[PDB]
Design a protein around this nucleic acid. Structure first.
Ligand SMILES: [Mg+2]
Ligand SMILES: [Mg+2]
Ligand SMILES: [Mg+2]
Ligand SMILES: [Mg+2]
Ligand SMILES: [Mg+2]
Ligand SMILES: [Mg+2]
Ligand SMILES: [Mg+2]
Ligand SMILES: [Mg+2]
Ligand SMILES: [Mg+2]
Ligand SMILES: [Mg+2]
Ligand SMILES: [Mg+2]
Ligand SMILES: [Mg+2]
Ligand SMILES: [Mg+2]
Ligand SMILES: [Mg+2]
Ligand SMILES: [Mg+2]
Ligand SMILES: [Mg+2]
Ligand SMILES: [Mg+2]
Ligand SMILES: [Mg+2]
Ligand SMILES: [Mg+2]
Ligand SMILES: [Mg+2]
Ligand SMILES: [Mg+2]
Ligand SMILES: [Mg+2]
Ligand SMILES: [Mg+2]
Ligand SMILES: [Mg+2]
Ligand SMILES: [Mg+2]
Ligand SMILES: [Mg+2]
Ligand SMILES: [Mg+2]
Ligand SMILES: [Mg+2]
Ligand SMILES: [Mg+2]
Ligand SMILES: [Mg+2]
Ligand SMILES: [Mg+2]
Lengths: 175, 104, 55, 136
RNA sequence: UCACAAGGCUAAAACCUUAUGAAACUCCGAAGGGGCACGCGUUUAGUCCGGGAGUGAGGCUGCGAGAGCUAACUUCCGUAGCCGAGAGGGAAACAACCCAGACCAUCAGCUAAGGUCCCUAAAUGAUCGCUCAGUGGUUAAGGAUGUGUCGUCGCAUAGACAGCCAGGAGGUUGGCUUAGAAGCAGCCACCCUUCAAAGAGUGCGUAAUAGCUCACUGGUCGAGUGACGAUGCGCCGAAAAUGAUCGGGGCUCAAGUGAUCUACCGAAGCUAUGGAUUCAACUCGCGAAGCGAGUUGUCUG
RNA sequence: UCCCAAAAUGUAACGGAGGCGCCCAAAGGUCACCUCAAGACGGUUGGAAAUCGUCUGUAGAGCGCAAAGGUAGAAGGUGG
RNA sequence: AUCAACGGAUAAAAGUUACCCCGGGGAUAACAGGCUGAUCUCCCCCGAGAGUCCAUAUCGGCGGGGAGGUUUGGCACCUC
RNA sequence: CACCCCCGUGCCCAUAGCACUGUGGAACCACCCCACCCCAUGCCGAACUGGGUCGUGAAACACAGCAGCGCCAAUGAUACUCGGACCGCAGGGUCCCGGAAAAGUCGGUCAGCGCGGGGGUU
């Protein structure tokens, strides 16, 4: 990704298909503007747990993560982006997608897999190595079976911002 | 429970009164009776009772009333307002009173 | 700045009238010189659109 | 359908949709495009359409809900004498607002059940699919 | 506070995550407005005392609301402007909209809105495109291999999209239902066999069989081709009463249209020359003030 | 009294809701003193609610009547 | 002092007129027109279902989009 | 204030609060003890009040630690919007110019400034 300018004035890029953005170091803070096309390919690939390299039209290239995204409600498209300039050894808290794997023995007698909370926000990994997904097995799961936030296998050096008796990926009855 | 003190405290109209207010503190067996010009964050006279007391523990009220009012003579204080505390104006603090109330 | 009244006051809001009045213009084609200060240049801002402004 | 207890009468006004433009509770979602009013029965209609097409069972999230009382005067009365008495209920769906969420069904199924619901609707719509993690 | 979407949890309420509506909800909260001081800087009004009134039916448009059907050349308020009491140019015609406030004279010049094929003043202007539908010259959900422009995805020198030859399989009438259901009226699952390839399978079919064909592969060729949205201009949907039509003629070999540029025409607006009136200040006569005169400014629906 | 009422006042409708034509000799004056609703644990009648205790507790109560604002350093409850 | 029609005409007061009269009003209704189009009339979209079987031969639920101006109205704009 | 600390009392009215936690004792504070009287309990020295210790600093208070909570809170962008202009039959919407939120993200924070007195620095 290679933005260029950053003035408080948008007419330079608006139509040209660029998004207004800000990346903050927490010590260093920088406004700017990225090619839409790019950040689209990108944010689709890497999502919120992203991590990609950002070289401002001045030479200096810094790594970063995606902290928030701001949409046109009516066009359903990016107009602005909040960008976290990553640190090194401890970052912030990462929201990551619960998935599901294998034909559950719920969908075979009556019900269906229901990811009651799509996105699970954990505390920390050590940033360099962020979990980007989060597989949960479901094959054991019958109909009427809730998976609390505890039972999720974290990949070492990871904890849970979640209340870990909160219902996540649960299988629901029919009708 | 802090209600009695902040009660009478606000009930002593601080500045707009003109007069000076006069603290006490007889809860322990030591008091502090300060004289304050309210408005200015400054405390004028005062006359404690923990730098030698004669011996009397509550009998000495009249004494420090007279001692304070004595300091008030010199500094030039003739007007007053009685900032009691959670103290129900009866014996001890009444002594400090009557004492200052004549010995000004 | 310099100033010209090149639009008109009719069907224009009361204050914009009275401001046209102040700036000293009482007919189209009226031009004038003005003293770069916040109250006069702030009298030209509010009726900007009625004025051809020079410098 | 209806609310259960309230105040009675109301009014009318508009600009773009507050919350929420994003896709929770599901994998596929249907979104307004126009500043309509939406009556119970219209939703009821979309609910029954989609519910049938999914058969048993899928999963259907009817986000929008009619809290707004609309009134209509009696037949053939000269204006005044009062305000009209609660004809029916509308839900003030502004553009971009997500009306529907369905999940537990394929993309195909979702498309169709949507289109079918759309033809029952006062306004143009569009279907879409997640990524809108403004929060969760 | 009232209302409300999925879930947790518990004996339902409270409470937990997720999620949302509010004129009569508010943790917050603009733009703006209102008061007061200055005038730091322009300009002309103000206030009070007294004489004379008239008016007290308003009207439209925009914006803000209620009422109403988010109807009315509707009704009732807030707010700006116009008409009222406003002539002049434009909008064919047209109180109100757009431009613009008409002291008088002129066979003089510039402009505004709006315009420059002929009726009709002024470029049948320029350059890059768009639409071919008379769209232009009045409506919608819905629909559509119209045409321009972007983007997504897919398939392809392992031979594809189309075309053409052939196979399309054995378990197996899969189970269930059924008077019979055997791919194909309704309820559960999509497993093996043979191969270069053949899926309890798509439509027609039968009361049910049988039957026709597709999803896959091979040859054949010989190259691109297929899907999904975004958007510009159009197509259909588009049916009313006396005779048609964009105001008309007519316009695409643009007189339609999106963009940028310039030249011209256009008002009672501005300007030129002449002239009168209102007020004002300056100058003069007679006897302050007052009247007349004159000059400058000013004004005059 | 609230909303309409367009964050100054004001502003109409046979617009949307609700009260008043009293009451109090203490419910006033002053002086002094006290702090609420509700939930959780445990408690003879009880056992939804009674009365007691512990913990939480900024108002989630109370103010003679309508509602709005207001109010816990009292306007709220008690006494001279 | 329900002078409560609450700025309160008298101390003191109800009906009827198709026998009717006067002065005015299109400031205001019944006819017609006009504007609107809820209602009224038709046409279109989706298709669940009916049609042994098969949505569309024909019919078409729950809902949606328009037209027309012949209904009952709404408004009160020229004509009392 | 000379340096500390404690007691009172203020400006400040949560970036100043709460929890968890550690420290503190004859030197100020607190609990404590006694109550027939002043005084007082809608009953009871619980509280007001009165005579005073030792004992304990556990409770409470003072002080320190801490960012779990609470509170404070950016820039960026947006909503809306004065004022210039526009589109749509209409519900509604756009452009230019200035102003410009709220919620959230970054974070920030276990406050700060005084007066008086007491008591300590072999
Ligand atoms: Mg906040
Ligand atoms: Mg009148
Ligand atoms: Mg009137
Ligand atoms: Mg009026
Ligand atoms: Mg009208
Ligand atoms: Mg005219
Ligand atoms: Mg005219
Ligand atoms: Mg004409
Ligand atoms: Mg007209
Ligand atoms: Mg022009
Ligand atoms: Mg000509
Ligand atoms: Mg002249
Ligand atoms: Mg004139
Ligand atoms: Mg206002
Ligand atoms: Mg009025
Ligand atoms: Mg009388
Ligand atoms: Mg008869
Ligand atoms: Mg007769
Ligand atoms: Mg007779
Ligand atoms: Mg007559
Ligand atoms: Mg009739
Ligand atoms: Mg009629
Ligand atoms: Mg009908
Ligand atoms: Mg059937
Ligand atoms: Mg009619
Ligand atoms: Mg009339
Ligand atoms: Mg009228
Ligand atoms: Mg505007
Ligand atoms: Mg802006
Ligand atoms: Mg700003
Ligand atoms: Mg602390």
């Amino acid at each position: 990704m290679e933005l260029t300018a950053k003035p408080r004035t948008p007419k330079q890029k608006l139509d040209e298909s660029m998004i207004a953005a800000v990346a903050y170091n927490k010590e260093n803070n920088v406004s700017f503007a990225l090619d839409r096309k790019a950040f689209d390919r990108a944010f689709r690939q890497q999502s919120t747990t992203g991590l990609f390299d950002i070289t401002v039209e001045g030479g200096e290239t810094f790594p970063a993560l995606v902290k928030a995204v701001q949409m046109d409600k009516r066009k359903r498209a990016p107009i602005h982006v909040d960008f976290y300039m990553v640190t090194y050894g401890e970052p912030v808290e990462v929201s990551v997608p619960v998935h599901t794997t294998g034909r559950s023995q719920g969908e075979v007698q009556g019900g269906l897999v229901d990811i009651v909370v799509h996105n699970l926000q954990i505390v920390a990994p050590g940033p360099r190595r962020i979990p980007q997904e989060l597989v949960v097995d479901v094959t054991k799961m019958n109909i009427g079976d809730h998976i609390t936030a505890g039972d999720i296998k974290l990949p070492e050096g990871c904890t849970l911002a979640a209340d870990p008796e909160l219902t996540v990926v649960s299988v629901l009855p029919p009708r | 429970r802090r209600k009695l003190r902040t009660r009478r405290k606000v009930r002593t109209t601080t500045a707009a009164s003109g007069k000076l207010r006069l603290s006490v503190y007889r809860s322990s067996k030591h008091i502090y009776a300060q004289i304050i010009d309210d408005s200015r964050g400054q405390t004028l006279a005062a006359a404690s009772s923990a730098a030698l007391k004669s011996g009397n523990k509550t009998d000495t009220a009249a004494a420090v009333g007279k001692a304070l009012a004595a300091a008030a003579a010199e500094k030039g204080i003739k007007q007053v307002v009685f900032d009691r505390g959670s103290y129900k104006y009866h014996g001890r603090v009444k002594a400090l009173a009557d004492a200052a109330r004549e010995g000004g | 700045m310099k100033i010209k009244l090149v639009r008109s006051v009719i069907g224009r809001p009361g204050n914009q009238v009275k401001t046209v009045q102040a700036l000293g213009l009482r007919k189209i084609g009226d031009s004038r010189e003005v003293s770069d200060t916040p109250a006069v240049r702030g009298m030209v801002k509010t009726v900007k659109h009625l004025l051809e402004v020079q410098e | 359908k209806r609310t259960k207890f309230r105040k009675q009468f109301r009014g009318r006004m508009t600009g773009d949709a507050k919350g929420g433009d994003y896709v929770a509770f599901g994998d596929y979602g249907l979104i307004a495009m126009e500043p309509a009013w939406i009556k119970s029965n219209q939703i009821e209609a979309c609910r029954i359409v989609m519910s049938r097409h999914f058969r048993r069972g899928g999963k259907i999230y009817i986000r929008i809900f009619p809290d707004k009382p609309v009134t209509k005067k009696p037949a053939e009365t000269r204006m005044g004498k009062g305000k009209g008495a609660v004809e029916y209920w509308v839900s003030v769906v502004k553009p971009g607002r997500v009306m529907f969420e369905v999940a537990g069904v394929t993309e195909e199924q979702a498309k169709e059940a949507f289109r079918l619901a759309g033809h029952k609707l006062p306004i143009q719509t569009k279907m879409v699919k997640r990524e809108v993690y403004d929060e969760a």
